[PDB]
Amino acid sequence: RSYQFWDTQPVPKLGEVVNTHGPVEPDKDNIRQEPYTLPQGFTWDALDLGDRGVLKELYTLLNENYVEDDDNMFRFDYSPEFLLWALRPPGWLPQWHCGVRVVSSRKLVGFISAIPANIHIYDTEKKMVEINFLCVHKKLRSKRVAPVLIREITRRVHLEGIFQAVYTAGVVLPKPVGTCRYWHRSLNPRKLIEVKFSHLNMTMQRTMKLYRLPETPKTAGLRPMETKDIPVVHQLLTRYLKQFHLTPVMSQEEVEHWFYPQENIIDTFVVENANGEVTDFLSFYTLPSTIMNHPTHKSLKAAYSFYNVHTQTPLLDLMSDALVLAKMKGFDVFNALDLMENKTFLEKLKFGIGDGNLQYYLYNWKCPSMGAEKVGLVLQ
Numbered sequence: 001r002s003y004q005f006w007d008t009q010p011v012p013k014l015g016e017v018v019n020t021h022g023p024v025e026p027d028k029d030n031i032r033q034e035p036y037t038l039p040q041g042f043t044w045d046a047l048d049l050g051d052r053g054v055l056k057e058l059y060t061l062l063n064e065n066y067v068e069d070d071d072n073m074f075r076f077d078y079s080p081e082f083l084l085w086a087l088r089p090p091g092w093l094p095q096w097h098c099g100v101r102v103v104s105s106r107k108l109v110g111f112i113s114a115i116p117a118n119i120h121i122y123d124t125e126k127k128m129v130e131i132n133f134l135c136v137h138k139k140l141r142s143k144r145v146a147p148v149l150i151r152e153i154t155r156r157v158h159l160e161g162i163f164q165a166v167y168t169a170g171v172v173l174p175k176p177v178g179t180c181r182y183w184h185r186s187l188n189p190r191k192l193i194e195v196k197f198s199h200l201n202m203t204m205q206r207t208m209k210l211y212r213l214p215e216t217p218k219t220a221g222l223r224p225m226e227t228k229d230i231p232v233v234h235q236l237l238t239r240y241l242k243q244f245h246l247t248p249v250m251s252q253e254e255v256e257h258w259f260y261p262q263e264n265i266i267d268t269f270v271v272e273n274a275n276g277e278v279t280d281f282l283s284f285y286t287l288p289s290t291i292m293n294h295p296t297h298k299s300l301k302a303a304y305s306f307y308n309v310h311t312q313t314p315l316l317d318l319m320s321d322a323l324v325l326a327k328m329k330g331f332d333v334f335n336a337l338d339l340m341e342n343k344t345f346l347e348k349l350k351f352g353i354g355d356g357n358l359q360y361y362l363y364n365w366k367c368p369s370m371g372a373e374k375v376g377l378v379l380q
């Protein structure tokens with residue numbers, strides 16, 4: 001299996017064991033000043049997501065052309081407000097919101113993005129970027145536009161003195177540093193079976209009983225995160241992540257951004273104990289999917305496990321409360337990867353394994369691969 005594009009890139013070869021730690025190639029001290037050439041009739045445009053019209057254009061591109069399931073039944077439906085959250089974290093740069101437009105019509109037909117992130121990989125902390133929202137319009141697929149987008153964002157990141165990146169994809173490329181699986185926990189099994197997200201030895205009555213949850217969380221002192229909690233959430237997260245081999249390193253400003261609750265985007269609940277001390281937190285983000293070509297049910301409301309930190313509340317209890325909270329908030333399904341300590345609760349809390357993998361990658365960094373349990377990084 002050859003990779004016309006990926007074989008040219010500073011990434012390790014598939015099927016080869018890495019015993020070392022470090023960059024694949026030495027840092028470039030001169031970088032190409034001019035954008036890479038797009039096919040005729042197409043032009044680069046940096047997207048100002050602070051402009052409502054431009055943000056809506058990106059929303060529409062992704063709504064119509066972004067990630068689908070392996071059965072082409074469900075497509076991610078990131079909201080405009082969610083995209084602002086994901087794409088304008090602390091240190092975001094305008095040149096890193098990289099759009100492709102049709103010259104004549106101005107139609108947005110391609111996108112890729114970088115956001116800055118400090119990443120801890122084994123014993124090294126590196127300033128990197130996280131690459132996300134790579135998207136080529138359906139009508140432009142299989143025309144080698146993706147490699148141009150990747151090279152162009154690489155160039156723009158290089159200009160800023162950054163030479164490593166982290167990214168995830170459902171497809172196998174050279175070369176995963178970790179392989180994860182999505183698991184799903186049914187909250188509204190009736191709807192999930194109706195739209196064929198899930199299927200029914202069990203009746204519908206038994207299935208609804210099986211997945212039924214308490215109407216309120218059980219953990220004493222669970223409450224939404226507030227401004228006063230930003231420092232302790234930062235403290236808790238930073239200490240908790242030390243045990244994994246691939247993690248973000250977040251400033252307090254970044255913790256505020258990624259965790260402070262925003263309705264329909266990000267939920268974070270902290271446990272404040274009988275002493276007034278915050279000892280644990282749970283978080284999940286909101287990402288619905290379009291139910292493709294369906295006459296009645298148009299959208300699937302999904303919550304995604306983000307970072308869950310336990311020091312005094314058992315993780316099992318925290319996650320049980322996360323499910324209850326998601327149910328209360330009207331979610332149809334709660335999704336979680338098998339990374340960090342998630343395998344300790346997935347089967348227990350009646351999660352079912354999903355189709356397809358989520359591969360974790362580094363660009364221009366060689367290191368040994370790790371088990372899912374050692375991956376401590378969750379991306380939007």
Ligand SMILES: CCCCCCCCCCCCCC(=O)SCCNC(=O)CCNC(=O)[C@@H](O)C(C)(C)COP(=O)(O)OP(=O)(O)OC[C@H]1O[C@@H](n2cnc3c(N)ncnc32)[C@H](O)[C@@H]1OP(=O)(O)O
Nearest residue numbers: 003004005006066067133134136141142143144145146163
């Ligand atoms: C230091 C700074 C570094 C910064 C950069 C770090 C690297 C970042 C890397 C990007 C991280 C993205 C993270 C996310 O956003 S993952 C989300 C990706 N988006 C989607 O899946 C949405 C719907 N799908 C599409 O829009 C796709 O069909 C895309 C746009 C992905 C491919 O468009 P198209 O189907 O029209 O194909 P092509 O003819 O233009 O090009 C074919 C080449 O593209 C390689 N390909 C296909 N899919 C992916 C993929 N997901 N990551 C990397 N490479 C991918 C493929 O192996 C082949 O190369 P090779 O097999 O010949 O070698």
